[PDB]
Amino acid sequence: GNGPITFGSNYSDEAPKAAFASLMQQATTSTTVPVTVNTTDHNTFQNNISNYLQGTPDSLATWFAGYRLQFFAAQGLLTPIDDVWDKIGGTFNDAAKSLSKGLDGHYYLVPLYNYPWVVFYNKSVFQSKGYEVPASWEAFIALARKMQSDGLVPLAFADKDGWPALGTFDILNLRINGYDYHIKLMKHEVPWTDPGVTKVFDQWRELAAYQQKGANGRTWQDAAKALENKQAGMMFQGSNQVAANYSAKNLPDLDFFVFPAINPQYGTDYMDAPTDGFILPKKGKNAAAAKKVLQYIGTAEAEAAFLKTDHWDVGLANGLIAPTYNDIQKKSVAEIGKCKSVSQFMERDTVPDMANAMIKLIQQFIDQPTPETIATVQKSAEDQAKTIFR
Template sequence: MSRRTLLRSTAVGVGAVTLPALLAACGSGPGGNKNEVTVGSNASDAVPKTAFQAAFDAYEKESGKKVKVNTKDHNDFQENINRYLQGTPDDVFMWFAGYRMQYFAEKGLLTDISDVWQGFTGFSDALKAQSTHAGKQYFVPYYYYPWAVFHRKSLFASKGYQQPKTWDEFIALAKQMSKDGTPVAFSDKDGWPAMGTFDYIDMRLNGYDFHKSLMAGKEAWTDPKVRNVFDTWRELMPYYQKGALGRTWEEAGQSLQQRKTGMAVFGMPHPGSQFPENERDDIDFFAFPEIDPQHGQGAVEAPIDGFLIARKSKNISGAKNLLTWLGKPKAEDVYLRHDPNNVAVNSGAETSGYSALQKKSAELVAGAQQISQFLDRDTRPDFASTVMIQAIQEFIGNPKDVDGLCNKIERQKKTIFSQTAD
């Protein structure tokens, strides 16, 4: 079954996928074990999986309590989150800030942790806002990572490539790179990686406010502003790796590491997890280029990941105790010692050991005028999964019929946004 089919069946609540096979929570039965907290984890890649385990081990040592981690494939976790939360979820689960959190809070599938937040320090008002729905907190932020255009420093130095600041310079660089090989790594088999490029082009052309309004269903996808996004994107496509719809993000990251491609629009962990440790210092990035000077490069895509408590948690007091610890700077310090591909959200976290890439990432986000979360986090999950994954993949497969594509998205958007989120 394809990822698109899985997502479609999940979002509308139908289909043949059985949740226990994908996201079975290994709970301890009715009432739960009060000395054990179960955690549903989407950290299936080796680096974050190891880092999270180190953090949970540190909590166990300090608290004397047990943490049982149930790790599932990252994509499977995201595709089946609706059923997971309505079924037999773990006490705590990993998820995303902003709209993605608010959506499930509105559906009554999360536990209010406003009491936990009363003891927190080091979180900005902006972070608290990303963790809040209807005046209550439901989310503990843990780290963030920016999206940008990543490349090898050594490749740019050896070839004399210069980091572009504008779209015209970006296209000129891609044209220059094409003489030496494939300029841009590109993948969308997973259904979400190309969304980052759409987001950036839209924010650079039309501004952050328009992009947020578009994601909220308040703008028409037939608006010339949206059509211009796809038309502009099409300028970059001749410089992409061929066969993007059959390539995973890991494979695209590996092509960057192997010098088969020159650059890629990625989140910070994506190239970081595909480079061996002794080569990570060679990773660099530049902010997604300016297209319209009116909007510049002020908006930065920087998703925030963290923890929530399911409403059906069997051990809410234990879950709150774990989240109280995870919200402390030292909890982030433990994690980041094992995963240098993210940036701490708590101002009290230790940053002296940051790599050059982490420092540059923190500076990029600190200087941002606006911060977006990512297309599939900034809009309704059902719209992202049943409409936008297919739409962007259709565009990649046939980038010429922009009018037809935008008309189709708008029809589907009207149907979905006219419905109450179920």
Template sequence: MSRPRTEAEYLARLVPPSVAGIGRRSLLAGAGAGALLGTGLLAGCGSDSDSGSDSKTVSIGSNQSDPKPKEVIAKVMAGFQTASGIEPKVNTVDHNTFQENINNYLQGKPDDVFMWFAGYRMRFFAAKGLAGDLSDVWGKLSGYSDAFKKASTGDDGKQYFVPSSYYPWAVFYRKSVWQQRGYQVPKTLDDLNALGAQMKKDGLTPIAFADKDGWPAMGTFDILNLRINGYQFHVDLMAGKEAWTSDKVKKVFDAWNGLLPLHQADSLGRTWQEAAQSLQQKKSGMYLLGLFVAQQFSNEEQDDLDFFTFPEVDSTIGAKALDAPIDGYMMARKPKSEANAKKLLEYVGSKAAADITVKNDPSTLVANGGADTSGYTALQKKAAELVGSATEIAQFLDRDTRPDFASTVIIPALQQFIKNPKDIDGLLNSIENQKKSIFTS
């Protein structure tokens, strides 16, 4: 449930200085989906276990190298082998190996199935013809909300992704603090502002906030954009199809500017963990972050932790869309055995696979709503209900747009806004000009 490095940072590490001058879109298009998680890198590391076309095997490219996720994936794959008789061959590589072997990696062939992310990353590969159509697999899946299916759908209306796990963003608070003060969950932005003003009077910092690492502020921008302009505008803006200089985007920054006085000061020098400590120590009243914030609280304190979805700004848009980054699986354009690959994808999207994940890693929220989640904590159960009721699920800014745009333009722009929120027009003109350059490269 930990929040990984931003997708921008992750992909940046795939590109060594020797090829840093190549346009990111060109690099990815030339590499192919499999070049990011395929057998080429492993071949470069001395593994050729996937050579040949054994009809009883299927290869999986995995970037889950940490012990617990790796262990859970192994158990899921063991379940698949028992159910299907097909042997899954998992090729696990860590981020450093990705970077160190990038040239061999790009020259290799993709695994049949590879782990990736929903949203723009998935749609980009699908639009380039670098991923296999999984619409027929989706015809056999059950337990997924329409929002999960939408997050797995390419620009052409076909599905290219099978979700496995996720974590939602929401506004977290300590129940004991709110009960003591008599605070009520805000339903509108005006309510939120009024609550923040009361918290200030009560000696609390209304909203814990940190942006030293660059990505947390993206969550604030995302939720305001979703609430003010709706999901489709947000997706189109991230894809470079809408202008950052539009009145719609200005309205987002105007609303954010109004909230800044409620935020913890000096955020650019603070990590998200340090901001979480402010909430943990009952010095702040609220904190907008992902569910991974719970890691900063003891088991006893987690019982005192609760959350609400960010309130509505426009009643015609409501408050049903949210950021809930989704991890899952995709299929190579031309797997060695498409039938085996699709059998695996049908399995990893099943209740059986989700049950194995929940049983072995209770900190994970599984995407399949049919899974046995009786082992979930109260916080996890509520998080699952929140995402299950969402009408749309965004993937977080650095997953919903190009990684180079997120890292080189948006991170410094949002930090500049936090330092000086007065020149919104100048800031948005700068973003738009850089966007045009990057998205046409």
């Protein structure tokens, strides 16, 4: 019941590979279970996942919350871990529990860390110009308008990379229609022609008045540099992007606020906070020992250990403020922990083909944000969805 397990790992980059190796040494010291880490190139591992689970997988593997976790669990490829959760459940909130379950209500994932998609700004600028953090869409638009009058681009914005704008779609949908609807849309339980989608794009027509021009030709780093150089007042994106891009000298001035409330029914209850974790392949060997290792992974100590050298991701364990966290991380723990549910970014909440189809359609909207373009986007997205989810 304690024999060596194997661990399939997509941590191929130097820093996380070293952190994961150290973490497994700590796991063995605690649980007695020895571990062999089988590392595969990150992208390759992702690309081979279904074939991997169906072949002769490792005892445990790295994965993450979202559509594919639920797809594999639905398919019978994953061992449920309700037993692990009987031991570790007290450490996690409702959002953490939700993102760890399959459609059938069993647990399949042990999560480790996430990071937030939120609106960044410079504290010194807000202090100097008399800008207040907006809780509501009305205050947000009023602030954007004040910024324009002050000669500042309100929202630095970039989408040459294709994926950044998906975050704006997600947050508008979570704020207008709510989490349950957003996930239904992701799963194609609601069609892209649904009026809730029209309402998202209608809201974006307003927002786009305050978004940086030339976005489709701009890299996200160039938008982040605009914020850093004080040429823009705010920028909405992931903290492991915007904050990571800041120089060490300017990072002290960086802060963020959650995207403002639009429909008070959903307040600011939801956020894209992509969450990485671990699964137990049904076809893996030595399940009993693998479960002991998962129990260890589902602790504050495990999260703090892995995250020592990670400057942006934060643990999901209740009350964990690791001694290595910076100010951005401390606020991230607080703001992510307040959410009732967290989504995982469009690329992980729907199938890849569907997210990729939306990239181009959203660029088309950005190029011409009109009612006719919205109708075109909705029809094109729904037709793509019918082919993808067949």
